[PDB]
């Protein structure tokens, strides 16, 4: 009773819905912003698009809602729909690639002397620079800048919790990636009067090892038929034609591979590294098989009286066997041996190279997890 | 000039949902017209389209002719949507999607009570293009639209030219073309047996298409293909013995290519419309290509195999010579190529005929509807 109807009344009589919990132009209302992440569902590492979900915990004080006996001293804590406070119509300078879901228009926790607690989980369409640099083992970092899209920091100050909180705090276990750390730094670019956005850093690490495995098999298994086509010459010289069949076959195979590679990066591309040199490794088996094909080509051919008849017989046979013996002199196997071992150098050299680069790529550019 | 009082006077009596109908037995005079401006999606196989239509809306309601303070002030007024009779438009046969930006827009109230309004609308519809619209003779797109709310005994729509156009702003990036747009103003009585006519707006659109890009992708390959098979056909007379199988390699290659085509453009017609006439010449000129093609191997299949002590022994050896000769003789009576050579000219003129039958007829199915 104690002026309850009265209080109750006066409050709703004088209280202003559309007003800011501050008095004039000054230090403003110090709103607390801090989100406990739920998990993340889709990383479009290719366009640098980020759809995650977290809690929008906001909290500041409404010294305009401090109650009295019944709602203050009666029930120190009571729930009341928002819709009555300035809400950070927050957009993300890079990210905020789309609207809020479970972000605004939801109830809030209002304390006795005016404290306000609003904890809503939400899904948000963002876009961070995971750029086409989300695959190097050295990976990269990003700028996630949150802030309102009609308000300018003049009638409120934004403030954070931790900066180490981490993003693996609610990292998706469903992620083909992994994370090292999440930096959180408060910002106010001076290119705009409006103090604004906060930059949040993603020192992301995404190592999904699954198909590069059977990709290796081509390179090496194709090599099987490759070393084979380079081995088949002094193995079965008649490989002559069958050889060409091999490369038709070998080339179509690698071209189909050419088919799956562009359409697969089509959703998760970054630096060429792997492709850069396998591209070379490609060109390598490609041309090596084709010049060996020219190795194959280079051969212009390969690619008394009684006794007289006898004598005429003696000369017939012998005469042309030298001729076909000439073909021997012409297609001997010197080259095959020499370049099948130049094949030895080439393929085992260029092989242990990307082997190496790849080797160097996973270990060397790994520690910049920062 | 009573400016305030007048506004306040009518608004007193101002009636929303009531039509400016003098009385109830002669309806109101409603004017409408549409200027196409965007034909956004042509999915003819399903007979649907999306267009930005200028919904020219006009009618009469002197319920607000004004005085010196509003009529005379300016013979022109722009008053909000929700403030006068509004035709909830839709295309009987087409509009399959509620109008977008076609309503809730500023209307126009001159001074005598003339009302003009014209919102732009992107919406979905379903015109003809029913197993036809892909010819050279075109199916006239007939869209009739009217208010879907009341029926002509209270409402009456007007129109204008039924002779003059859809190509007024027909899109230049369309894979088609328009040649005429007729439009009639009419009463309501359909196949379904509905009475009390609510007048509507008929939209004829007989348009052309077929600006083939795929044509010569189809025309040069087939000639290359025909020649390839005619290679198969004449190449044998030129080709060595190791060519029978040579020819085969081509059949394999020839149809690998073939059904791959059969898979390529069939896809084409499913994502877009469809029609069988042009379809008939291809697959059957194609099946004949295949026919005489396998016929060829069955042709390079046909034939049986082409697919004193001194003298006693001189006697018998002179026999292996004549003996084997009888054998090589076999080859003779078997491979005297009357059928093959002639098979070249067989397919040749047959080629000319299949071609003439087809391109001559393609000449016709472009020339009757020309």
């Amino acid at each position: 009773s104690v002026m309850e109807d009265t209080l109750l009344s006066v409050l709703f009589e004088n209280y202003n819905p559309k007003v800011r919990p501050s008095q004039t132009v000054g230090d403003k209302v110090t709103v607390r912003v801090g989100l406990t992440l739920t998990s993340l569902l889709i990383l479009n590492e290719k366009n640098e698009e980020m759809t995650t979900s977290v809690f929008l915990n906001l909290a500041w004080t409404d010294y305009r809602l401090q109650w009295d006996p019944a709602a203050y001293e009666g029930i120190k804590d009571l729930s009341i729909p928002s819709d009555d406070v300035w809400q950070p119509d927050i957009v993300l300078m890079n990210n905020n690639d789309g609207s809020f879901e479970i972000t605004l228009h939801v109830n809030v926790l209002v304390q006795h002397t005016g404290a306000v607690s609003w904890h809503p989980s939400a899904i948000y369409r963002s876009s961070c620079t995971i750029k086409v640099m989300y695959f190097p083992f050295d990976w990269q970092n990003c700028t996630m800048v949150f802030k309102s899209y009609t308000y300018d920091t003049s009638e409120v100050i934004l403030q954070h919790a931790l900066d180490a909180m981490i993003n693996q705090d609610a990292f998706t276990e469903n992620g083909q990636w992994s994370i090292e750390h999440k930096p959180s730094r408060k910002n106010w670019r001076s290119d705009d009067p409006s103090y604004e956005d906060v930059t949040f850093y993603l020192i992301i690490q995404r190592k999904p090892l699954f198909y590069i495995v059977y990709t290796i098999v081509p390179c090496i298994l194709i090599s099987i038929l490759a070393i084979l086509v380079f081995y088949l010459p002094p193995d079965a010289g008649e490989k002559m034609s069958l050889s060409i069949s091999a490369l038709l076959a070998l080339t179509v195979f690698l071209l189909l591979l050419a088919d799956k590679v562009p359409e697969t990066s089509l959703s998760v591309p970054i630096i060429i590294s792997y492709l850069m040199f396998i591209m070379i490794l490609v060109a390598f088996s490609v041309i090596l098989s084709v010049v060996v094909l020219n190795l194959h080509h280079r051969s212009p051919n390969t690619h008394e009286a009684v006794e007289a008849i006898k004598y005429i017989a003696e000369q017939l046979e012998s005469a042309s066997e030298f001729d076909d013996l000439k073909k021997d002199w012409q297609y001997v196997a010197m080259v095959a041996d020499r370049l099948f071992l130049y094949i030895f150098i080439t393929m085992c050299s260029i092989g242990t190279f990307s082997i190496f680069l790849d080797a160097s790529h996973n270990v060397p550019p790994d520690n910049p997890f920062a | 000039n009573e400016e305030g009082r007048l506004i306040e006077k009518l608004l007193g009596d101002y009636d929303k949902r009531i039509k400016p109908a003098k009385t109830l037995d002669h309806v109101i005079d409603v004017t409408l017209k549409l200027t196409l401006t965007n034909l956004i999606s042509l999915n003819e196989k399903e007979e649907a389209l999306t267009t930005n239509v200028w919904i020219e809306i006009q009618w009469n309601d002197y319920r607000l002719s004004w005085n010196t303070s509003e009529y005379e002030g300016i013979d022109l007024v722009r008053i909000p949507s929700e403030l006068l009779w509004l035709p909830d438009v839709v295309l009987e046969n087409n509009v399959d999607g509620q109008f977008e930006v076609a309503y809730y827009a500023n209307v126009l109230v001159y001074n005598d009570g003339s009302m003009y309004w014209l919102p732009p609308a992107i919406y979905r519809s379903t015109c003809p293009i029913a197993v036809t619209y892909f010819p050279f003779d075109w199916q006239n797109c007939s869209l009739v639209f009217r208010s879907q709310t009341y029926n002509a005994h209270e409402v009456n729509l007007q129109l204008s030219a039924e002779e003059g156009i859809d190509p007024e702003d027909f899109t230049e990036n369309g894979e088609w073309t328009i040649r005429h747009r007729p439009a009639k103003k009419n009463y309501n009585w359909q196949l379904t047996k509905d009475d009390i006519d609510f007048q509507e707006i008929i939209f004829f659109l007989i348009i052309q298409r077929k600006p083939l890009f795929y044509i010569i992708n189809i025309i040069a390959p087939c000639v290359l293909i025909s020649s390839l098979v005619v290679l198969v056909y004449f190449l044998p007379a030129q080709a060595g013995g190791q060519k029978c199988t040579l020819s085969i390699s081509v059949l394999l290659a020839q149809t690998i290519f073939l059904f791959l085509i059969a898979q390529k453009v069939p896809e084409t017609s499913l994502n877009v419309p469809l029609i069988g006439k042009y379809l008939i010449f291809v697959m059957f000129v194609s099946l004949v290509i295949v026919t005489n093609c396998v016929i060829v191997l069955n042709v390079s299949l046909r034939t049986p195999n082409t697919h004193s002590c001194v003298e006693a022994c001189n006697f018998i050896a002179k026999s292996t010579k004549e003996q084997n000769d009888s054998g090589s003789e076999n080859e003779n009576w078997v491979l005297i190529g009357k059928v093959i050579d002639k098979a070249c000219f067989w397919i040749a003129l047959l080629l000319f005929s299949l071609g003439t039958l087809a391109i001559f007829l393609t000449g016709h199915l472009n020339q009757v509807p020309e």
Binding site: - | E46, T192, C244, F259, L287
Partner: protein
């Protein structure tokens, strides 16, 4: 005039729309519902989705709408805005995949008595069985039940009105054809609860599907592939000298149909059918494989066809006689006789299992055709 203001004002005050015209503890609210289907713009047999239009003919009564010379007297039948009506949350039980569209903001039929109807040109997306047994020749009847959503019998009741076919306005551009369409009513009380539950209209769509496009191309490559198989068998007789050639065409053949089955899975899972069907193709074609298995295995089935001066004349003709009986050996294996049994052995067996394929295929359509 005629109690002008007194009549419309009184009507608004003591009139309510949230309420339903409940009349004592009995038959519920007499709801009359029906399907008036005149267009089926889009449907997918695969996902069993249907976006069609059916004017929701509703019919029921509310005495409160009865009037005297001051509303009935005004103009017999008057049409009131739907708002005043308690609109049921009707919905497609195992369907309802989409909102009904165009029902809101519409006209309502009122009578001097009270009779009322409102047929809304409702268009919506549906969801009913088609399963893999949707498109056979023997059809399936999509069970479509419709009735009040969240209201139980104790408050509202609906009932059929008339029988009307599904083909009354069925899509002539459909990839299917109808046979019959029946709709009977019922009330469903459940063993769960002792209560008397909602009423509903159950439609059953009986119609056979499948255009013949997929059909023409399944069997063409089959007969054509049976031509090369037929060649497969005939060649060793007319050109066994190309057994290897045969090999090439099996790599050809095999890849082609292995690729044919690729199409199947895409198309089949892209357009639904009862698996029992592909079973036909399965063994029939594994039959060409099982048979080429044996036949070319059998084709390659054979070991390798897959004075003193008087003296040497004798060492010599000896040289020749040894080899001659030897060449007789390789021909001793390619007897050119079993080759004719294999094509005839299988020609009959393919003419028979083909006729077997032909059998259930035609038997099933001597069932469908019906």
């Amino acid at each position: 005039s005629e109690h002008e203001t007194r009549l419309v004002a009184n009507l608004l005050e003591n009139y309510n729309k949230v309420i339903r015209p409940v009349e004592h503890h009995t038959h519920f609210v007499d709801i009359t519902v029906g399907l008036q289907l005149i267009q089926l713009i889009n449907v997918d047999e695969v996902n069993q989705i249907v976006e069609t239009n059916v004017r929701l003919r509703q019919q029921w009564i509310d005495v409160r709408l009865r009037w005297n010379p001051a509303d009935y007297g005004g103009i017999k039948k008057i049409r009131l805005p739907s708002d005043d009506v308690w609109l049921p949350d009707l919905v497609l039980y195992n369907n309802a995949d989409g909102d009904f569209a165009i029902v809101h903001m519409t006209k309502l039929l009122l009578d001097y008595t009270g009779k009322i109807m409102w047929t809304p040109p409702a268009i919506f997306k549906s969801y009913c069985e088609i399963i893999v047994t949707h498109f056979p020749f023997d059809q399936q009847n999509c069970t479509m039940k419709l009735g009040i959503w969240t209201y139980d019998g104790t408050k509202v009741s609906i009932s059929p009105e008339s029988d009307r076919p599904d083909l009354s306005t069925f899509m002539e551009s459909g990839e299917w054809v109808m046979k019959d369409y029946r709709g009977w009513k019922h009330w469903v009380y459940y063993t769960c609860c002792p209560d008397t539950p909602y009423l509903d209209i159950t439609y059953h769509f009986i119609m056979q599907r499948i255009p013949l496009y997929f059909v023409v191309n399944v069997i063409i490559p089959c007969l054509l592939f049976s031509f090369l198989t037929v060649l497969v068998f005939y060649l060793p007789t007319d050109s066994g000298e190309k057994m290897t050639l045969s090999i090439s065409v099996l790599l050809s053949l095999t890849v082609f149909l292995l690729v044919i089955v690729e199409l199947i899975p895409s198309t089949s899972s892209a357009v639904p059918l009862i698996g029992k069907y592909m079973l036909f193709t399965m063994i029939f074609v594994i039959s060409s494989i099982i048979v080429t298995v044996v036949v070319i295995n059998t084709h390659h089935r054979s070991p390798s066809t897959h004075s003193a001066i008087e003296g040497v004349k004798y060492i010599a003709e000896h040289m020749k006689s040894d080899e001659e009986s030897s060449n007789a050996a390789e021909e001793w294996k390619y007897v050119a006789m079993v080759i004719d049994h294999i094509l005839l052995c299988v020609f009959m067996l393919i003419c028979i299992i083909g006729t077997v394929s032909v059998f259930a295929g035609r038997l099933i359509e001597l069932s469908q055709e019906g």
